[PDB]
């Protein structure tokens, strides 16, 4: 939409803005998801080492 | 009557307390995890 200059470079700036931060929110999410899942990984206790129990 | 005699005077003496005690590092710190979890290594 910017090829033929049909928007505001300002505008496109704004669009990329969230599109930038959006994924970051995603990053905030996947980081989040792993967190609990990690805890669910904590649940189902893993032997932190190997050997005779 | 003839005897070995030592006439007495004031003699400064720095002898003083010899008392007990235990010794410590200084330098007597610890390592306390401030972050909780499994020790990986």
UniProtKB/Swiss-Prot annotation, chain A:
Belongs to the membrane fusion protein (MFP) (TC 8.A.1) family. AcrA-AcrB-AcrZ-TolC is a drug efflux protein complex with broad substrate specificity that uses the proton motive force to export substrates. This subunit may act as an adapter protein that links AcrB and TolC stably together. It comes from Escherichia coli O157:H7. Monomeric in solution. Homotrimeric; interacts independently with AcrB and TolC as well as AcrZ. Part of the AcrA-AcrB-TolC efflux pump. The chain holds residues 132 to 184 of 397 of the full protein. The gene is acrA. It is found in: Cell inner membrane. This is Multidrug efflux pump subunit AcrA.
